Ligand binder design. Sequence first.
Ligand code: CLA
Ligand code: CLA
Ligand code: CLA
Ligand SMILES: CC(C)=CCC/C(C)=C/CC/C(C)=C/CC/C(C)=C/CC/C(C)=C/CC/C(C)=C/CC/C(C)=C/CC/C(C)=C/CC/C(C)=C/CC1=CC(=O)C(C)=C(C)C1=O
Ligand SMILES: CCCCCCCCCCCCCCCC(=O)OC[C@H](CO[C@@H]1O[C@H](CS(=O)(=O)O)[C@@H](O)[C@H](O)[C@H]1O)OC(=O)CCCCCCCCCCCCCCC
Ligand SMILES: CCCCCCCCCCCCCCCC(=O)OC[C@H](CO[C@@H]1O[C@H](CS(=O)(=O)O)[C@@H](O)[C@H](O)[C@H]1O)OC(=O)CCCCCCCCCCCCCCC
Ligand SMILES: CCCCCCCCCCCCCCCC(=O)OC[C@H](CO[C@@H]1O[C@H](CS(=O)(=O)O)[C@@H](O)[C@H](O)[C@H]1O)OC(=O)CCCCCCCCCCCCCCC
Ligand SMILES: CCCCCCCCCCCCCCCC(=O)OC[C@H](COP(=O)(O)OC[C@@H](O)CO)OC(=O)CCCCCCCCCCCCCCC
Ligand SMILES: CC1=C(/C=C/C(C)=C/C=C/C(C)=C/C=C/C=C(C)/C=C/C=C(C)/C=C/C2=C(C)CCCC2(C)C)C(C)(C)CCC1
Ligand SMILES: CC1=C(/C=C/C(C)=C/C=C/C(C)=C/C=C/C=C(C)/C=C/C=C(C)/C=C/C2=C(C)CCCC2(C)C)C(C)(C)CCC1
Ligand SMILES: CC1=C(/C=C/C(C)=C/C=C/C(C)=C/C=C/C=C(C)/C=C/C=C(C)/C=C/C2=C(C)CCCC2(C)C)C(C)(C)CCC1
Ligand code: OEX
Ligand SMILES: [Ca+2]
Ligand SMILES: [Cl-]
Ligand SMILES: [Cl-]
Lengths: 34, 34, 56, 97, 37, 334, 38, 30, 243
Amino acid sequence: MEVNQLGLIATALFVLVPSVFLIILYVQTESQQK
Amino acid sequence: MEVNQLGLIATALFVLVPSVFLIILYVQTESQQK
Amino acid sequence: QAWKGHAVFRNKEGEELFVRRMPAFFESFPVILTDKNGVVKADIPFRRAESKYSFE
Amino acid sequence: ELVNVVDEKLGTAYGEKIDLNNTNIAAFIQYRGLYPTLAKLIVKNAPYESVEDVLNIPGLTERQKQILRENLEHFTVTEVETALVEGGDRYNNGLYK
Amino acid sequence: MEPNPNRQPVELNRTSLYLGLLLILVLALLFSSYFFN
Amino acid sequence: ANLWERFCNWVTSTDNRLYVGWFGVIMIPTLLAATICFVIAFIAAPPVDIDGIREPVSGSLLYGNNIITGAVVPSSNAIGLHFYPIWEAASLDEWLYNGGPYQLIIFHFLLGASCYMGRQWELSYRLGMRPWICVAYSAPLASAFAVFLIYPIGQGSFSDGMPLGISGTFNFMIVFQAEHNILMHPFHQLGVAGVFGGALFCAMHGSLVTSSLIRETTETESANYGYKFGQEEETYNIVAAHGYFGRLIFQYASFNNSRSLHFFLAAWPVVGVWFAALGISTMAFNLNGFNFNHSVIDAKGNVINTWADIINRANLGMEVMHERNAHNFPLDLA
Amino acid sequence: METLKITVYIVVTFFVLLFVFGFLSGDPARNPKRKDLE
Amino acid sequence: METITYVFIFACIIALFFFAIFFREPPRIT
Amino acid sequence: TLTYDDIVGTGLANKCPTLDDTARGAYPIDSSQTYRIARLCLQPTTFLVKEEPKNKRQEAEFVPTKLVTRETTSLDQIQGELKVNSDGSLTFVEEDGIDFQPVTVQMAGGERIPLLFTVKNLVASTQPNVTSITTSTDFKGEFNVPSYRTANFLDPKGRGLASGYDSAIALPQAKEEELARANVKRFSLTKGQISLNVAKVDGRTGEIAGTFESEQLSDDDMGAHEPHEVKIQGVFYASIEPA
Ligand code: CLA
Ligand code: CLA
Ligand code: CLA
Ligand SMILES: CC(C)=CCC/C(C)=C/CC/C(C)=C/CC/C(C)=C/CC/C(C)=C/CC/C(C)=C/CC/C(C)=C/CC/C(C)=C/CC/C(C)=C/CC1=CC(=O)C(C)=C(C)C1=O
Ligand SMILES: CCCCCCCCCCCCCCCC(=O)OC[C@H](CO[C@@H]1O[C@H](CS(=O)(=O)O)[C@@H](O)[C@H](O)[C@H]1O)OC(=O)CCCCCCCCCCCCCCC
Ligand SMILES: CCCCCCCCCCCCCCCC(=O)OC[C@H](CO[C@@H]1O[C@H](CS(=O)(=O)O)[C@@H](O)[C@H](O)[C@H]1O)OC(=O)CCCCCCCCCCCCCCC
Ligand SMILES: CCCCCCCCCCCCCCCC(=O)OC[C@H](CO[C@@H]1O[C@H](CS(=O)(=O)O)[C@@H](O)[C@H](O)[C@H]1O)OC(=O)CCCCCCCCCCCCCCC
Ligand SMILES: CCCCCCCCCCCCCCCC(=O)OC[C@H](COP(=O)(O)OC[C@@H](O)CO)OC(=O)CCCCCCCCCCCCCCC
Ligand SMILES: CC1=C(/C=C/C(C)=C/C=C/C(C)=C/C=C/C=C(C)/C=C/C=C(C)/C=C/C2=C(C)CCCC2(C)C)C(C)(C)CCC1
Ligand SMILES: CC1=C(/C=C/C(C)=C/C=C/C(C)=C/C=C/C=C(C)/C=C/C=C(C)/C=C/C2=C(C)CCCC2(C)C)C(C)(C)CCC1
Ligand SMILES: CC1=C(/C=C/C(C)=C/C=C/C(C)=C/C=C/C=C(C)/C=C/C=C(C)/C=C/C2=C(C)CCCC2(C)C)C(C)(C)CCC1
Ligand code: OEX
Ligand SMILES: [Ca+2]
Ligand SMILES: [Cl-]
Ligand SMILES: [Cl-]
């Protein structure tokens, strides 16, 4: 099918960038003193 | 130029995935008790 | 899609000529045709000015 | 070179008159006395080499022949078009109101 | 559940972050031409 | 305890991470079968002859669909209301052509979701709760029954059931409008009041409780930490909330009783959605929306259009175009 | 066709029997409060 | 590639359900 | 004697009548008498499709396929004149009946092949001097294969021959030339061939049964693609009558 050739990178970064932001914040929360 | 259409996503994930791994580890180190 | 068939090359005298095959090492390879005994009979020349074996 | 055969037929007499060889049967409602009795006989006995050949359908009454004669000016004939006569389309061409 | 005594904290110091990012970026700068071909 | 007694104790155990229970004994396998078939069909199913006219419609991702266009396509109009399990087909290839996955999925789903409702009663009983959460869930459940079972029954075919897909859903809605003028039906209008109102009251309740949270935190932390799971004291001031909302409108239009307020929150959307479900389920038997086509006429007898007549023109467009190769006769009677 | 049919028929019968016998196995008593409902 | 992308996102969501249920932070009465 | 209620949903309605093994008689033809086939039935049992040649240009074979449109395949209640010709051969001239069925079969790997399985306008003849129809009689002839879809049929983008758009309206400014084959619908009309091999004859009742093999083209999607060659094999039944 003749899809937009930037759709793959657009979708991948749309997921990765904010997901990574959240994982960074989560993990550094966990590593803080209990 | 007739480049490989997967080169962009390949390069972006090659950078992002390990870079993100390192940033996650760094930030959670910083947030640990001094 | 399909085999074109076996190509048999002949010169003006009607002698069968054989194209030298490309070995795997070579990304590009010249076009040289010999008789059954390996004597050069035709080629595709690079320099034309002193060509003696052109297909023409 | 590809042609839509129905559009092409519209540029012939088929686009101007009731084509005894092709036109769907409801077209005979246009003129007094043709539908359904004569309309059925006409479609059933098609194709016709010429318009006047419609007068040669067996069993006709003298009245029917005269109605046909008065209406020949509204008829034409062109080559049978498979696309228009297949599917029983001369009897029901999928058009209602 | 009773906690697992084998757990250890993990560390990446800043210098290691910088070294790692350099490795990754330079590898990407090197390999990118080949990925595009 | 013997084996059966032990099994019963485990099934009905209040200690399982997810409650099983007797409804769950039916729910688990049926929902798993429906889910697995749906996932596989949505990705990989070949085109399906929905309208029984040998015009297969592609629903699956691998056959040229994206998430928005994709569906599991309803079973063939040639089948109608006939039960078409895998074993009635001569082959899987035939089963797939005729839309067998749709029937397998919707039947397992409807059974499973009905058991989901029973299971809600069941656990409420084991925990010593009041029993009516399941009655609230009867609203979306009834709606699913309407579009997957009752509508097909009334029209005589599962080919008229709602497709399992985003665009197929819109197709169902547009054709439903053409054939029933659902927008002009008071049960769908009650449905809209139910969901618009549900959203309004959801936002309202959210905002009022949030507005009156008792200060328990500092500005550098989420106010959410001001509430601790299981605390005895209420976390907001209902008197301040009522004090606010009663002045926004007037005193007696505001709830000062939390039980009454929360009952209203349950009742408004549930009753509206019951009417929505009943709208679909009764238009299933072709008792349709209000028809004011040419209702207004002048002194001579000229038709004076109203907005109802403009709706009618839109509906006509839908009607004449839908399933463009399926009708041979002038009236669309089902 | 036939083996699948028989298999599903047996499977369905199995789970239905569990449902029915399960609810027959003193279900009113399986609550946190008053158990003597017989 | 599109199909792979759609199925990949779906599969991540299903995995997320698993972790959100079985590996949630447990609710604790204080 | 079976009723509709005995038959409904069994599959028997898609089967042709059979004659038992004792039916090996001869049905006399009086060349002064006129005849009709009062009922011709054709029940396909196998559909074969000629594979498209890879490019080797050897003999492409007819391969098996899976029927996906269920027990909806048979031609039946067909009637027509059975002429006695001057050389004593018989010619069947098909007049009317349920003389077509759309059929979809599926090749290994998934390709679906719709066809209009048909004997429309069949003209089939025997060998000369057939003084009786016997288990040695055969009928051979040709028939018409009209377009699988008729002229009103609209494609998924609303394009058709006697109705519909004449362009790709979703691509308002695309160059038309590349889309002409999809935009301009064409109505196919080709010939098919059939052999009827009599295996059983009831001399007393005028009933005959046997096997058939027909060859015809499949659907061409109103000229959008090349049709496949199909070979259909099955059993037949006919009742001959003086008329
Ligand atoms: C909880 C388990 C469960 C249930 C209830 C169902 C139910 C169903 N299956 Mg599914 N299935 C299951 C698990 C289940 N399945 C599992 C684990 C698999 C993988 C092997 C499958 C694989 C499968 C396939 C491949 C298909 C089905 C199909 C069906 C349907 C027809 C079944 C049938 O004809 O039985 C007939 C059985 C009876 C009538 C039982 C009678 C015997 C009892 C004892 C009498 C009392 C029952 C009576 C009706 C009243 C109910 C009691 C009530 C008052 C409490 C139905 C929606 C078919 C389908 O979906 O068609 C579209 C189909 O093709 N199933
Ligand atoms: C100013 C904008 C406006 C207003 C006033 C309305 C009003 C209405 N809509 Mg429309 N609607 C709108 C915009 C609006 N709509 C827009 C932009 C869309 C998308 C295009 C729609 C789509 C839509 C659909 C599809 C439907 C409606 C329907 C309705 C009715 C029920 C609404 C409801 O229950 O909501 C939830 C809100 C509440 C439950 C709060 C109560 C609201 C009531 C009506 C106010 C009462 C005021 C009262 C008369 C004042 C007296 C004071 C007294 C104390 C003295 C109501 C007549 C339904 C209908 O037509 O029914 C016949 C219906 O089917 N709306
Ligand atoms: C602003 C405009 C507007 C609004 C607000 C509405 C509002 C509504 N419409 Mg109307 N409609 C409109 C315009 C509008 N419509 C127009 C313009 C048309 C013509 C094109 C229609 C034609 C139309 C039709 C044909 C239908 C509606 C229906 C509805 C309702 C849909 C919600 C619902 O069914 O909840 C009920 C809840 C459900 C259906 C959900 C069931 C959930 C099941 C039980 C569980 C599913 C689990 C899931 C698979 C997995 C979960 C996740 C997992 C991880 C657990 C709602 C009242 C539907 C309705 O009334 O159905 C009864 C309906 O069939 N509308
Ligand atoms: C230039 C000039 C002339 C200036 C003069 C201006 C001037 C001084 C005027 C004074 C004179 C004067 C007053 C004139 C009046 C003129 C006039 C009549 C204007 C009309 C205005 C108008 C259109 C009014 C419409 C009426 C209106 C607002 C109706 C909507 C309100 C309504 C129906 C409410 C009921 C809905 C309902 C049941 C709500 C409950 C559900 C809900 C919100 C639950 C959530 C919730 C509720 C709680 O309760 C609490 C507790 C909590 C926790 C909580 O979750
Ligand atoms: C592609 C086709 C093929 C499909 C094949 C799929 C078959 C899967 C079978 C594999 C079995 C392993 C599963 C175990 C995981 C588990 O649940 O354990 C978690 C706990 C722990 O088990 C607890 O186990 C305890 C022991 S221990 O902790 O495990 O050691 C024990 O004390 C306790 O009694 C018990 O409840 O189990 C329970 O809480 C009870 C079981 C509830 C399972 C119900 C599933 C609901 C599915 C709904 C359907 C919708 C699906 C749609 C997707 C969104
Ligand atoms: C002219 C017509 C002729 C007449 C024909 C009659 C038609 C039948 C009318 C139907 C009668 C309704 C009875 C309601 C009783 C009731 O609910 O009591 C329960 C409580 C009791 O009130 C609470 O009452 C409590 C005291 S007590 O419980 O009553 O003892 C008190 O503590 C509390 O503060 C107070 O709020 O009512 C409430 O909680 C607040 C009212 C909420 C409205 C309920 C209606 C349900 C939602 C509407 C349906 C949606 C429709 C729109 C579609 C989207
Ligand atoms: C592009 C991104 C999108 C992809 C997203 C898809 C997945 C989303 C989920 C990711 C978030 C995970 C949250 C961590 C949960 C947690 O509590 O961790 C701790 C848990 C134990 O629970 C815990 O255990 C802890 C102690 S211990 O670990 O048991 O020692 C304890 O602190 C705690 O009380 C207890 O709850 O144990 C772990 O360490 C597992 C964490 C690792 C999860 C990441 C793996 C994801 C890849 C899976 C892909 C499957 C491939 C297919 C093969 C079949
Ligand atoms: C398919 C799924 C795949 C996902 C996998 C994710 C991949 C993650 C990859 C991780 C790589 C990170 C590297 C860590 C980098 C890092 O942490 O370095 C510093 C680190 C120091 O470790 P120490 O023992 O001092 O401990 C410090 C701790 O804080 C580290 O955790 O030493 C190493 O890790 C050894 C590797 C040397 C690497 C040196 C190379 C850098 C030199 C620059 C080269 C580029 C320039 C060249 C110019 C010519
Ligand atoms: C792929 C793609 C694309 C693209 C995109 C892009 C190109 C982007 C970008 C972008 C960007 C490019 C962004 C950015 C950014 C940024 C930022 C966000 C930043 C920041 C910062 C900071 C944080 C800093 C800090 C600091 C410092 C450094 C020093 C001192 C001080 C301070 C601390 C302040 C498109 C859409 C076309 C299409 C599809 C696909
Ligand atoms: C883009 C691109 C591509 C692609 C790629 C891919 C497709 C990939 C993939 C991949 C992958 C897909 C991977 C993966 C992975 C993984 C992992 C790494 C994992 C893990 C895990 C874990 C860690 C876990 C954990 C756990 C749990 C969950 C539970 C309990 C236990 C434990 C803790 C063990 C290519 C090259 C073609 C080309 C160019 C571009
Ligand atoms: C024992 C028990 C249990 C459990 C259970 C279970 C866990 C089950 C399961 C189950 C299951 C897990 C099921 C399933 C299933 C399924 C299915 C039934 C499916 C299907 C399918 C299909 C058939 C497909 C097809 C196709 C398509 C659609 C497309 C492409 C092609 C093909 C052909 C592949 C409980 C806990 C309750 C308790 C009591 C006892
Ligand atoms: O299939 Mn689905 O939609 Ca109920 O209407 Mn008649 O069918 Mn058909 O047209 Mn309109
Ligand atoms: Ca024979
Ligand atoms: Cl449609
Ligand atoms: Cl119709």
